[PDB]
Amino acid sequence: GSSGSSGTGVKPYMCNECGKAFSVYSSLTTHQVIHTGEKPSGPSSG
């Protein structure tokens, strides 16, 4: 999937917490979860 020519590429759904792009809207939201962390944790990237 996402087979094109321009390697660089580009996607509308991009995360700001870490900086990861996606080709799906839902995927972007389901991903940001890794930053939401509703429960209290220790080791966190950002």
CA distance 4 to 27: 20
- As measured in angstroms, the least distance from the Cβ of 38 to Zn ion is 16
Map the footprint of Zn ion across residues 3-32, applying CB under 5 A.
15, 17-18, 20
Q: Which is nearer to Zn ion, 9 or 29 (CB)?
A: 29
Q: What is the size of the binding site for Zn ion (CB under 5 A)?
A: 4
**CB contact set of 11 (below 8 Å; sequence gap of 6+):** 21, 22, 23
By the criterion CB under 5 A, which residues form the site for Zn ion? 15, 17-18, 20
